[PDB]
Design a protein around this ligand. Structure first.
Ligand SMILES: Nc1ncnc2c1ncn2[C@@H]1O[C@H](COP(=O)(O)OP(=O)(O)O)[C@@H](O)[C@H]1O
Ligand SMILES: Nc1ncnc2c1ncn2[C@@H]1O[C@H](COP(=O)(O)OP(=O)(O)O)[C@@H](O)[C@H]1O
Ligand SMILES: Nc1ncnc2c1ncn2[C@@H]1O[C@H](COP(=O)(O)OP(=O)(O)O)[C@@H](O)[C@H]1O
Ligand SMILES: [Mg+2]
Ligand SMILES: [Mg+2]
Ligand SMILES: [Mg+2]
Lengths: 528, 526, 538
């Protein structure tokens, strides 16, 4: 190089180009994939990440682990992005996507080092991915009967498969039944905001319950609250968005009087306004009053004197769930509290759960919402239980959308690898090597499963390859018996969309990484 | 903690960047001295780190007085030094040619051509250039002094000494002719050792001359000596003429009263014996590279002998060559053949405020000194450099009596011949061949640029002229910017210088084209 | 005798951090070298076989693309000459929308050959004059190189074929699908009136399902949720309000002056009754969807829920105007019920979830409307951004085709023919201008050379074959990238074509930038300042 008295780019700009740059990109992708390798399979392990604030997060979820890592390598961030994409679109497979992408890049690295043109590799990946997706759609097993029992069993099996890698895998049948029950009560959109997740410290995992209704924590009761009865047997619920307090009529309001009689009249008028609101609420027949805005002590004592229940400052989403379950309407005005806008539940009760008070609305027959109350011995315990249940919920929702399943345990990918190898053996030969590399790369997941289980990956892979070649589509890794088994008959079921999205995203990430040849890093501005 | 498979201070570069940097560094080196070529060259002032000033237009001196960091520039500096040492002329030409060849090679390197192909084409072109240069050469009768003087004048027309051309040419020719020596069937010139150049600031440059003998900045040891001897018999020595300690430890032990005086008297007697052994040959001048004792001076003046002491070994060797003497390290072994007869005059005269010893009338001397008088030390240094160039050119012509046309005529003729040969190549390496062939046009182009005329019109006219049959001696007139027949202007230059220039330029291009990786920062590990 | 003082005059008068460069070697060659460096940095992304580049700006924002204009935007270019060439490229992007890499490559080649000409002995003025003459000759030749015309723009297949070439340079693997999408979106737009608006094509990027799952929608998509409880309307009668969905207030100052208890008790009840009357009046016109640009009052939302009116809030007024154009409504400044002319109609409005984000869709069933939207799926944000850049290039190509319908062969065929014709013209012109004209013609070789280099073949063999075929008389023959060896093929049948205006404007701007760079003789750079950006750029 030369000093170049006036330089072209700003001083401090770093540029890397050529084969070394792409090889380094592949190595960075390998490094990222290594961080989630041991989290895959029933024998997977959890990771603990501590941030600068000292708060530790414990997760088996690949997307969460990748997000927590402060990745700054531009090529490595693609793996995190595709993990986020897989979590958003599907909700499961956030580790398989990264493993597949890194394995693709690793398999094609030797060809890159030989000077092979990246466009050829990109075309080979596109062809292989299209063929693999078509094969998945072709061989996916579906039942065209719409049988309720069969559909529920399929959903439960999919939830169990999605759950048999987390800390709650011991109670996976229990939690899968809970998740299927929760999802089946959503109406048509399967909105996630309609499934509440409450975490209460203390108690065992089996103590966790699903409320066929709505439940939320007690919200800063005022004085006189303890005189209110805490159990009703057919209450009418008045959902309100109203501040039941003595307060200024308006922010800009001002009262100008010149007589003590008018002063007393104004005071009595404020009191009468509050009491008129309370009386309009009371005459509606409602026994439980929930408000999004604060309810004052005067209103609390007024309701206590009438054997009523009040709870102010209820969170908005909890009020929405209460409306969806009991079947009323949130009223910003109490002037027309007809029976149409009043909720109704069979039993309302306030009980204690692990040192916290919760309000229970059970017995709703037309409920379109749920509430999970999760019990655990630690904060991160409950958080990871929530993450596992979220994975199961996404899986069950996707299965509701389309009941197409493929066998897990790597069986689907071994079948895809065999199909792609057979296809590659019938092409000129420049694309043959790359498609064969793709097929070999698809074998990472069963190998990773065997490695995590402490198995002999080579022997299991050889047996799987021979079995698939000689006949058998759903033969995968059997973790319990340290052998191979028909995973379809073992009910290791995954929705086809999970693997479809995984292959698509991994191929797109690999093609994007390979397509780059130069990286330019401008100097940081305002480093401070 | 930091692993560092390699050391932290190690930095590595590779790829197209290295080649571009090397070629640009060579181009910059060439651009430094591009303007110092031709009869219309402009001088430059160099400030030494020691506080001195060098004012010159010689390419090698300018490049030597520059410190660079890019190793390609170091290669170019070494190339200039090699050209100066091998032939003494053509340093600016070889630097410019190397730069131009590297530029035209970068042209192809920007495309998808491997440097090995360019190197092979360059080597084929170098062979063809050598063949054509040998073809267009003409012979020279070395016995003709007029032709030799004309060749030297063509050599020094571009230097600051050109204003006094006949004087400098005669000085160089006479020095080279009289230093020429032959013994035991081996011929030698040896301008480095003999033909010493001594510069005394002051006087006028017209008073500069080559002496038929030697000059040293020495005076007689004693004022009673003779400062003017007509036909001296000179004796040269290495050993001191004084009492000295022995090699072995030789402690004495004195117990008698008369032993001390005896020791001192025997020291005196040893000095007397050495002086008598010297006197036995009846010489007139005694020269020693080491000290001469005061008692020895007395004993020599007793015999009317002029003595000079503390002379450098190189100076004493030059004196021996000049006066036909032989250095003797033991006076008791002094033979008649060792006494130097042949010097026709010895004179100690004072120039300015210093005494100088002249042995300047030798008959058939094989060594000489060049007395330079000038305005100052920088002017005299430049004059000495120009005289060195002239003597190197004269020696090259004497060794190789071939000549080639100057003024860029040889460049254009060889370029045309190579271009004509290139149309039959019908390959992929013909393009670098033709490009490096036409890269020779940078010498006439630089000459025209320095003259100040129009480069494109004159160069096109010269190419059209060289496309004819008998036009290999058509070059550029450096003073008027006109096309002339080079055999009419008569600026010819030795074939050896041109061959060395072409070879060195092509070899530099090959060497620098071959490198694509640079690693630096590692320790010497010595 | 140990230091060289500054020369008396301007050198001593110069400021501390200032720099002064004068003369050929010190200014012009340095500028040419800087421009050549910039062109070389951008060169590798040219053509279909161009490679994407990860560019990280000063804000740690990652750009991966092969769009030359974007790369130059995100690069901290410091040299003034390179800045000038970047300005020319950005002007080409603004005027046409494609051809920025061509501008940069042509300017770099022109400046390199200008340095070569100056070295052989030509003057700057002679080079500039020859370049201008050759540019005029090229602009004269160019209309004769037109091979085919668009000849239709309301078709789908034909316009898709036209736009395939423009978005084949970027996203070389899958350009047919993107061409079909952009063609459908542009054909929905561009009514019987010849005016075509680029802004009417909206791109909404939703993450998750790969770019092959992208679709075109006749309407608008907004990534947010509804304020009310109604989430789907089948015969939308949207009424758009540019005012907050709340009781209008005085602009001067509000103060409720209460003097009696009756007023204090009746104020809130009267306000509620008034707002209920307003909402009922709005609903009586049949408006089942209400869109507002401001906040929504709680009582307003309650009374809208009571009357089953879907509420959508648009914070950005540009989105409000675009929605008004899409539906055919007028933004009411007040909360008055809309008359039949101001009430927009959309055949379906609903709340939906695509991937993860919640979206509100104003969907038309006809294949028409003022605004059309392309929803882009994908697995990465950067990939979706690159697809959006390709969509912008396709839309700009469609706009250029609407302006001028003439097309020229691509893949270096037009460049090679132009070089041949300009060389033939310069072979006849006497004087020193012939060297500059021939160098200008040779500068066109940088396009097929770059295409061949990116494709991975030998450029010299491709160029020699191109000259051979063009001398034979085939003006529509160019580089064939679907081969492992240097080969050429006729590119009228291949359908690889370029817009005439794109080439015309690119040539004009590149030549102008080159001659403007050459005109500079002295540079006086002031001391750099660390100011918080010039106030003009904010
Ligand atoms: N009972 C099982 N036996 C064998 N393999 C299983 C079983 N359950 C799940 N797997 C495998 O675990 C993999 C998914 O691991 P997991 O960490 O749960 O989700 P992710 O795909 O996000 O990593 C799937 O490829 C599946 O084949
Ligand atoms: N009177 C002249 N007219 C034209 N050219 C000349 C004349 N004298 C010398 N030259 C040319 O100038 C060159 C010598 O330049 P010089 O400064 O000696 O360079 P270098 O020091 O590298 O030899 C020779 O090639 C010769 O052809
Ligand atoms: N299929 C193809 N075969 C050969 N050349 C092509 C093909 N498609 C496009 N090109 C060429 O690529 C060039 C476009 O390069 P591009 O990357 O778009 O730069 P810019 O964006 O500055 O136009 C066009 O000149 C065209 O001739
Ligand atoms: Mg899973
Ligand atoms: Mg010379
Ligand atoms: Mg383009």
């Amino acid at each position: 190089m030369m000093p170049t008295p006036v330089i072209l780019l700003k001083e401090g700009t770093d540029s890397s180009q050529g084969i070394p740059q792409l090889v380094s990109n592949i190595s960075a992708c390998q490094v990222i994939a290594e961080a989630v390798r041991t989290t895959l399979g029933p024998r997977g392990m959890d990771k603990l990440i501590v941030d600068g604030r000292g708060k530790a997060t414990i997760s088996n979820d690949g997307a969460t682990i990748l997000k927590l890592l402060d990745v700054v390598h531009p090529a490595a961030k693609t793996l995190v992005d595709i993990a986020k994409s897989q979590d958003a679109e599907v909700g499961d497979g956030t580790t398989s996507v990264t493993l597949l992408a890194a394995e693709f890049l690793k398999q094609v690295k030797p060809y890159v080092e030989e000077g092979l043109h990246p466009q050829i590799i990109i075309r080979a990946f596109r062809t292989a991915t299209q063929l693999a997706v078509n094969k998945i759609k072709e061989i996916a097993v579906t039942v065209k009967k719409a049988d309720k029992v069969e559909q529920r069993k399929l959903l439960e099996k999919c939830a169990m498969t999605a759950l048999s890698s987390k800390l709650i895998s011991q109670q996976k049948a229990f939690f899968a039944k809970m998740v299927v029950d929760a999802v089946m009560m959503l109406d048509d959109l399967l909105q996630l905001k309609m499934i509440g997740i409450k975490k209460v410290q203390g108690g065992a995992l089996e103590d966790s319950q699903l409320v066929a209704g709505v439940a939320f924590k007690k919200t800063f009761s005022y004085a006189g609250f303890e005189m209110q009865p805490k159990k009703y047997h057919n209450p009418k619920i008045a959902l309100l968005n109203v501040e039941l307090e003595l307060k200024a009529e308006k922010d800009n309001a001002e009262i100008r009087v010149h007589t003590v009689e008018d002063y007393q009249a104004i005071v009595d008028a404020e009191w009468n306004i509050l009491y008129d609101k309370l009386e309009k609420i009371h005459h509606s027949g409602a026994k439980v009053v929930l408000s999004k805005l604060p309810i004052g002590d005067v209103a609390t004592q007024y309701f206590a004197d009438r054997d009523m229940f009040c709870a102010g400052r209820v969170p908005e989403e909890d009020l929405k769930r209460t409306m969806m379950a009991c079947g009323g309407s949130i009223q910003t005005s109490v002037n027309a509290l007809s029976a149409d806008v009043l909720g109704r539940c069979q039993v309302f009760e306030e009980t204690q759960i692990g040192g916290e008070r919760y309000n229970f609305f059970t017995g709703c027959p037309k409920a379109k919402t749920c509430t999970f109350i999760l019990r655990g011995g630690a904060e991160q315990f409950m958080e990871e239980t929530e993450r596992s249940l979220h994975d199961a919920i996404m899986i069950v929702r996707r299965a509701i959308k389309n009941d197409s399943v493929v066998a897990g345990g790597g069986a689907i990918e071994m079948e895809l690898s065999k199909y792609l190898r057979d296809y590659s053996r019938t092409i000129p030969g420049k694309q043959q090597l790359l498609i064969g590399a793709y097929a070999k790369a698809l074998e990472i997941i069963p190998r990773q499963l065997c490695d995590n289980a402490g198995f002999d990956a080579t022997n299991i892979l050889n047996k799987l390859r021979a079995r698939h070649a000689q006949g058998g589509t759903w033969y995968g890794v059997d973790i319990n018996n340290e052998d191979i088994a028909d995973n379809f008959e073992a009910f290791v079921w995954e929705p086809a969309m999970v693997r479809i999205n995984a292959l698509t995203a991994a191929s797109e990430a690999a093609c994007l990484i390979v397509s780059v040849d130069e990286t330019i890093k401008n100097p940081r501005s305002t480093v401070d | 903690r930091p692993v560092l498979v390699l050391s932290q201070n190690t930095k590595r570069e590779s790829g197209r960047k290295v080649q571009s940097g090397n070629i640009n560094a060579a181009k910059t080196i060439a651009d430094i001295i591009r303007t110092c070529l031709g009869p219309k060259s402009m001088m430059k002032m160099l400030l030494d780190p020691m506080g001195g000033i060098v004012m010159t237009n010689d390419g090698n001196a300018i490049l030597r007085e520059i410190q660079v960091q890019h190793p390609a520039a170091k290669s170019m500096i070494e190339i200039s030094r090699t050209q100066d040492e091998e032939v003494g002329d053509g340093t600016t030409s070889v630097i410019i040619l190397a730069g131009e060849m590297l530029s035209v090679a970068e042209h192809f390197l920007e495309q998808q051509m491997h440097p090995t192909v360019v190197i092979s084409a360059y080597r084929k072109a170098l062979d063809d250039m050598i063949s054509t240069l040998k073809k267009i050469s003409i012979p020279v009768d070395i016995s003709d002094s007029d032709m030799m003087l004309n060749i030297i004048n063509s050599s020094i027309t571009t230097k600051a000494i050109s204003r006094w051309s006949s004087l400098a040419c005669n000085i160089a020719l006479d020095a080279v002719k009289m230093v020429q020596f032959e013994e035991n069937g081996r011929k030698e010139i040896d301008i480095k050792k003999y033909a010493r150049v001594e510069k005394i600031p002051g006087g006028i440059i017209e008073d500069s001359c080559v002496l038929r003998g030697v000059m040293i900045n020495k005076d007689v040891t004693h004022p009673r000596m003779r400062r003017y001897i007509k036909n001296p018999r000179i004796v040269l020595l290495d050993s001191s003429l004084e009492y000295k300690k022995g090699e072995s430890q030789t402690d004495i032990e004195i117990t008698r009263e008369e032993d001390f005086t005896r020791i001192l008297q025997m020291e005196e007697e040893y000095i007397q014996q050495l002086c008598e052994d010297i006197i036995q040959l009846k010489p007139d001048v005694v020269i020693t590279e080491k000290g001469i004792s005061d008692l020895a001076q007395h004993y020599l003046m007793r015999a009317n002998i002029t003595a000079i002491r503390r002379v450098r070994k190189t100076d004493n060797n030059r004196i021996a060559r000049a006066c036909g003497a032989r250095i003797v390290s033991r006076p008791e072994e002094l033979r008649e053949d060792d006494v130097g007869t042949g010097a026709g005059l010895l004179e100690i005269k004072k120039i300015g405020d210093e005494y100088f010893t002249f042995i300047t009338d030798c008959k058939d001397p094989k060594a000489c000194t060049i007395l330079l008088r000038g305005a100052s030390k920088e002017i005299l240094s430049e004059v000495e450099r120009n005289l060195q160039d002239a003597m190197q050119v004269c020696r090259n012509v004497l060794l190789d009596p071939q000549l080639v046309p100057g003024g860029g005529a040889s460049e254009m003729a060889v370029a045309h011949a190579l271009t004509e040969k290139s149309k039959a190549m019908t390959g992929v390496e013909q393009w670098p061949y033709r490009a490096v062939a036409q890269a020779l046009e940078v010498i006439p182009r630089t000459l025209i640029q320095n003259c100040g005329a129009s480069t494109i019109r004159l160069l096109t006219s010269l190419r059209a002229k060289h496309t004819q049959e008998n036009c290999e001696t058509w070059g550029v007139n450096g003073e008027t910017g006109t096309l002339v027949d080079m055999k009419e202007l008569g600026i010819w230059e030795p074939l050896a210088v041109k061959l060395q220039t072409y070879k060195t330029a092509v070899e530099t291009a090959v060497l620098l084209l071959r490198i694509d990786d640079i690693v630096s920062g590692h320790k010497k590990k010595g | 005798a140990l230091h060289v003082p500054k020369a008396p005059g301007f050198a001593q008068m110069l400021k501390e951090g200032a720099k002064h460069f004068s003369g050929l070697e010190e200014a012009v060659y340095r500028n040419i070298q800087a421009c050549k460096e910039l062109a070389q940095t951008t060169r590798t992304a040219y053509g279909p076989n161009g490679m994407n580049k990860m560019v990280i700006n000063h804000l740690e924002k990652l750009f991966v693309t092969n769009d030359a204009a974007t790369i130059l935007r995100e690069l901290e270019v410091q040299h003034p000459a390179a800045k000038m060439i970047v300005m020319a490229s950005h002007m080409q992007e603004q005027e046409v929308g494609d051809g920025t890499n061509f501008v940069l490559v042509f300017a770099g080649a022109l400046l390199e050959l200008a340095e070569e000409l100056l070295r052989i002995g030509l003057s700057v003025s002679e080079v500039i004059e020859g370049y201008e003459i050759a540019c005029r000759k090229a602009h004269e030749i160019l209309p004769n190189l037109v091979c085919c015309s668009a000849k239709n723009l309301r078709d789908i297949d034909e316009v898709s074929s036209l736009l395939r070439t423009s978005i084949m340079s970027k996203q070389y693997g899958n350009e047919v699908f993107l061409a079909k999408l952009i063609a459908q979106a542009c054909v929905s737009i561009f009514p019987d009136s010849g005016h075509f608006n680029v802004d009417n094509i909206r791109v909404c990027k939703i993450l998750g399902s790969g770019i092959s799952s992208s679709s075109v929608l006749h309407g608008m998509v907004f990534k947010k949720e509804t304020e009310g409880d109604v989430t789907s309307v089948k015969d939308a009668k949207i009424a758009v309000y540019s005012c907050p969905f709340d009781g209008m207030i005085t602009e001067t100052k509000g103060t409720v002056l209460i003097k009696t208890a009756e007023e204090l008790m009746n104020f809130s009840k009267g306000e509620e009754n008034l707002m209920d009357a307003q909402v009922k009046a709005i609903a009586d016109t049949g408006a089942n969807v209400v869109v507002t640009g401001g906040k929504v009052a709680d009582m307003a939302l309650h009374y809208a829920n009571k009357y089953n009116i879907m509420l959508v809030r648009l914070n950005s007024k540009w989105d409000l105007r675009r929605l008004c154009k899409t539906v055919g409504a007028t933004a009411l400044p007040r909360l008055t019920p809309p008359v039949l002319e101001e009430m927009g109609h959309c055949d379906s409005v609903y709340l939906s979830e695509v991937g993860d984000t919640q979206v509100v869709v104003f969907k038309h069933e006809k294949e028409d409307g003022a605004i059309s939207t392309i929803v882009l799926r994908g697995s990465t944000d950067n990939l979706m951004d690159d697809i959006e850049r390709a969509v912008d290039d396709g839309v700009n190509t469609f706009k250029v085709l609407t302006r001028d319908k003439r097309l020229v062969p691509g893949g270096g065929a037009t460049e090679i023919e132009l070089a041949k014709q300009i060389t033939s013209y310069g072979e006849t012109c006497p004087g020193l201008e012939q060297y500059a004209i021939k160098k200008f013609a040779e500068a066109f070789e940088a396009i097929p050379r770059a295409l061949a280099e990116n494709s991975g073949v030998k450029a010299n063999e491709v160029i020699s074959k191109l000259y051979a075929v063009h001398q034979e008389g085939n003006k529509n023959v160019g580089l064939d990238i679907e081969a492992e060896v240097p080969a050429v093929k006729d590119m009228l049948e291949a359908g690889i074509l370029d817009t005439y205006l794109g080439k015309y404007w690119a040539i004009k701007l590149a030549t102008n930038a080159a001659v403007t760079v050459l005109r500079v003789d002295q540079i006086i750079m002031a001391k750099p300042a660390g100011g918080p950006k010039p106030p003009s750029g904010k």
